[PDB]
Amino acid sequence: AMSLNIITVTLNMEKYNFLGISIVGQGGIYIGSIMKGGAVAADGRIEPGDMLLQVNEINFENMSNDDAVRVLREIVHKPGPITLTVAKS
Ligand SMILES: O=C(O)c1cc(F)ccc1NS(=O)(=O)c1ccc2c(c1)CCCC2
Numbered sequence: 001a002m003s004l005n006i007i008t009v010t011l012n013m014e015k016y017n018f019l020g021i022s023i024v025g026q027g028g029i030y031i032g033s034i035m036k037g038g039a040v041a042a043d044g045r046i047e048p049g050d051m052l053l054q055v056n057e058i059n060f061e062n063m064s065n066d067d068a069v070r071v072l073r074e075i076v077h078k079p080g081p082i083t084l085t086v087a088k089s
Pocket residue numbers: 017018019020021022023035038068069070072073076077
């Protein structure tokens with residue numbers, strides 16, 4: 001049928017320090033902006049306005065903005081791949 005517009009992206013973080021995103025919201029958490037030099041810009045698929053559902057083992061639905069920033073820092077700080085599931089609608 002018609003797409004649910006849910007995409008899962010796995011980023012190899014071997015060549016990047018950062019995702020290079022800013023997040024907005026807490027009716028969820030959204031990509032506010034994408035920064036040049038990060039893994040997300042290089043991959044090209046995640047856009048501003050995409051809604052974050054899950055990153056690695058953590059669900060981002062009805063999360064506080066503060067909690068989202070803090071747990072993304074720890075997910076990025078830890079070497080290894082990062083899997084993001086986003087809603088594009
Ligand atoms: O790696 C990220 O882009 C990132 C994004 C967030 F929303 C939260 C944490 C992240 N990881 S991080 O190393 O702490 C960090 C904090 C701030 C910023 C970045 C990374 C990269 C873009 C400029 C602002």
